[PDB]
């Protein structure tokens, strides 16, 4: 037997009857651009939120697990992240309090061609400045993070990009790794949320 | 610093303020025998069906099992050992069938847990008339025990003779206390 919920039939309809720059404000809910690999960009909707876990949700129904533009997790993807620890203690939890110098250490695990992975990552946050982006036709300053990254076993070292509005803490785009310092993630949250 | 998820707005669209015939699986709900409540179902995960309520509300279930609350008065906090509960396989079940999990739930502000120890029973074929559409169903009776102290109740599922999807149950939301009772009403 299979039901047939809100989420998969409204989600549906949406790729069904589809991006527009009018059309994207217009949505009701948040969504965002999907860059993986340096590939093309792909549409995904914000599906629900558990645990302060935000769940977006693809139109081939692939799953990424995100807070405030982190990447914790991710499912039916030829890779995924599967786990991130500590991450309670990510300076994105609180954008606007971040200092210049913030540091965050955390181990993370995730498949790569069916195998898994993992490694032990030290990070530090590194004010880049001030930035507007125009993202859906709209301005926003943004604070510039730039979080330098280092893994050990191997030692690997890369560099991670948050664009964060500079009044609410909502980071509005981001540049990461999937990995320790491997298969980078591009997204960009189009729908901007008010003070 | 917010998001508009498609569930706070499908909640805004059908509970930010006081129908019938979707194109998605509904609920009718009845806790403690009250009045009767429109549910729908708002999406699955990792084969848990979650369902959306009025007042931010929330049910977790597996095939007519009820395994979470959320934001209600009294919630079913965790059921465990839930891969192993027959409903899984409505159609497998055979006049004796057992189960034994531990629950978690709150009543009054006070948590309570429980270990539970059922076992189904047949108790004949029935024919349900559920949006005006007749579904035969094979009824499954469940006797549920548990101690400390020591109770027992029956918990009864409406399991489709050919579908093996659950289209009624009435079970506890606790160890013998609170009833709930849940019609499955299919998207058409």
Same mark, same amino acid.
């Given at each position: 037997?299979? =039901?047939?919920?809100?989420? @998969? %039939?409204?989600?549906?309809?949406?790729?069904?009857? &589809?991006?527009? @720059?009018?059309?994207?404000?217009?949505? #009701?809910?948040?969504?965002?651009?999907?860059?993986?690999?340096?590939? &093309?960009?792909?549409?995904?909707?914000?599906?629900?939120?558990? &645990?302060?876990?935000?769940?977006?949700?693809? =139109?081939?129904?692939?799953?990424?697990?995100?807070?405030?533009?982190?990447?914790?997790? %991710?499912?039916?993807?030829?890779?995924?992240?599967?786990?991130?620890?500590?991450?309670?203690?990510? #300076?994105?939890?609180?954008?606007?309090?971040?200092? @210049?110098?913030?540091?965050?250490?955390?181990?993370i695990l995730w498949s790569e061609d069916n195998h898994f992975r993992?490694?032990?990552?030290?990070?530090?946050?590194?004010?880049?400045?001030?930035?507007?982006?125009?993202?859906?036709?709209?301005?926003?300053?943004?604070?510039?993070?730039?979080?330098?990254?280092?893994?050990?076993?191997?030692?690997? =070292?890369?560099?991670?990009?948050?664009?964060? @509005?500079?009044?609410?803490?909502?980071?509005? &785009?981001?540049? =990461?790794?999937?990995?320790?310092?491997?298969?980078?993630?591009?997204?960009?949250?189009?729908? #901007?949320? #008010?003070?």
């Amino acid at each position: 037997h299979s =039901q047939q919920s809100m989420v @998969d %039939t409204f989600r549906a309809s949406l790729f069904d009857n &589809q991006v527009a @720059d009018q059309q994207i404000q217009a949505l #009701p809910y948040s969504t965002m651009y999907l860059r993986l690999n340096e590939g &093309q960009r792909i549409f995904v909707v914000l599906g629900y939120i558990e &645990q302060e876990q935000s769940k977006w949700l693809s =139109q081939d129904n692939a799953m990424l697990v995100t807070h405030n533009g982190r990447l914790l997790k %991710t499912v039916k993807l030829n890779n995924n992240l599967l786990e991130v620890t500590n991450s309670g203690q990510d #300076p994105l939890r609180n954008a606007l309090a971040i200092k @210049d110098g913030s540091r965050w250490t955390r181990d993370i695990l995730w498949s790569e061609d069916n195998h898994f992975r993992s490694a032990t990552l030290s990070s530090t946050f590194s004010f880049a400045g001030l930035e507007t982006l125009n993202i859906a036709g709209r301005n926003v300053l943004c604070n510039v993070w730039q979080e330098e990254v280092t893994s050990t076993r191997p030692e690997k =070292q890369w560099q991670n990009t948050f664009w964060v @509005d500079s009044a609410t803490g909502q980071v509005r &785009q981001s540049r =990461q790794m999937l990995g320790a310092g491997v298969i980078p993630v591009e997204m960009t949250f189009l729908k #901007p949320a #008010p003070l």
